[PDB]
Design an enzyme around this catalytic site. Structure first.
Site, mmCIF file in Angstrom:
data_model
loop_
_atom_site.group_PDB
_atom_site.id
_atom_site.type_symbol
_atom_site.label_atom_id
_atom_site.label_comp_id
_atom_site.label_asym_id
_atom_site.label_seq_id
_atom_site.Cartn_x
_atom_site.Cartn_y
_atom_site.Cartn_z
ATOM 1 N N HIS A 106 0.838 -1.195 0.000
ATOM 2 C CA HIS A 106 0.000 0.000 0.000
ATOM 3 C C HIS A 106 0.878 1.251 0.000
ATOM 4 C CE1 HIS A 106 -0.056 -0.031 4.553
ATOM 5 N NE2 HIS A 106 0.047 1.253 4.351
ATOM 6 N N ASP B 271 0.052 -7.413 1.228
ATOM 7 C CA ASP B 271 0.480 -6.024 1.506
ATOM 8 C C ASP B 271 2.000 -5.995 1.614
ATOM 9 O OD1 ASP B 271 0.697 -3.327 1.843
ATOM 10 O OD2 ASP B 271 -0.826 -3.184 3.440
ATOM 11 N N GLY C 134 2.303 5.900 9.402
ATOM 12 C CA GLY C 134 3.718 6.247 9.187
ATOM 13 C C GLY C 134 4.560 5.012 9.507
ATOM 14 N N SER D 21 3.561 1.940 8.890
ATOM 15 C CA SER D 21 3.253 0.963 7.830
ATOM 16 C C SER D 21 4.531 0.577 7.081
ATOM 17 C CB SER D 21 2.217 1.449 6.836
ATOM 18 O OG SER D 21 1.066 2.015 7.413
ATOM 19 N N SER E 265 1.120 -3.755 8.236
ATOM 20 C CA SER E 265 0.090 -3.345 7.233
ATOM 21 C C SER E 265 -0.705 -2.174 7.850
ATOM 22 C CB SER E 265 -0.774 -4.461 6.745
ATOM 23 O OG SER E 265 -1.845 -3.997 5.931
#
Length: 191
Positions: free
Chosen positions: A35, A65, A145, A147, A162
């Site tokens: 993502h 992801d 942030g 992720s 994720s």
């Protein structure tokens, strides 16, 4: 740059680096959330966007992801995770997760936090068709942030952040993409 440190997309957007990896030919890349790579092809290691990280090499998001960024400088491919207290942990391999496992997450918004794997086969729905499944559920908090950051236990890489609910003030639940599926997809190994 080490696992857990901030990565910035050209024209805005921040995520965290997961782990540095290399192909069987010795080319180096950074793993992060799919993502994240979906938003831009060019990535930087500073907010001002003057130090180049590299360019997008792959994205697997909705469903999984995970994403890959090719390093523009092989020397930036540090095979460690940053612990946020001035220390680093060398990552030596990848492994599987299990319920009850104690884990640590490194991310650029909230630093290093620890917790436990509380579930497997988890699904998250980001709306607009963005459903991610087969995730590791944990009680480790995280904030936007974080992720793409590293989920590890000891010296073993386990997953990539994720997303989830809550924050690091009140507590939350975070979902991670098992790293081994990513390594497999791209024929890459932990640095």
């Amino acid at each position: 740059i080490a696992g857990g440190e901030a990565i910035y997309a050209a024209g805005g957007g921040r995520c965290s680096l997961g782990f540095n990896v290399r192909s069987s030919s010795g080319a180096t890349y950074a793993l992060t959330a799919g993502h994240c790579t979906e938003i831009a092809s060019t990535w930087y290691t500073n907010s001002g966007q003057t130090s180049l990280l590299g360019t997008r090499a792959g994205t697997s998001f909705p469903g999984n992801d995970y994403g890959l960024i090719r390093h523009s400088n092989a020397s930036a491919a540090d095979g460690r995770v940053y612990l946020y207290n001035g220390s680093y942990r060398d990552i030596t391999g990848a492994g599987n997760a299990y319920v009850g496992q104690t884990v640590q997450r490194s991310g650029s918004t909230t630093g290093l936090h620890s917790g436990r794997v509380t579930g497997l086969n988890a699904t998250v729905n980001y709306g607009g068709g963005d459903i991610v499944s087969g995730l590791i559920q944990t009680n480790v908090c995280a904030e936007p942030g974080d992720s793409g950051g590293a989920l590890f236990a000891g010296s073993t890489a386990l997953g990539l952040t994720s997303g989830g609910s809550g924050n690091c003030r009140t507590g939350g639940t975070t979902f991670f993409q098992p790293v081994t599926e990513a390594l497999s997809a791209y024929g890459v190994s932990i640095l």
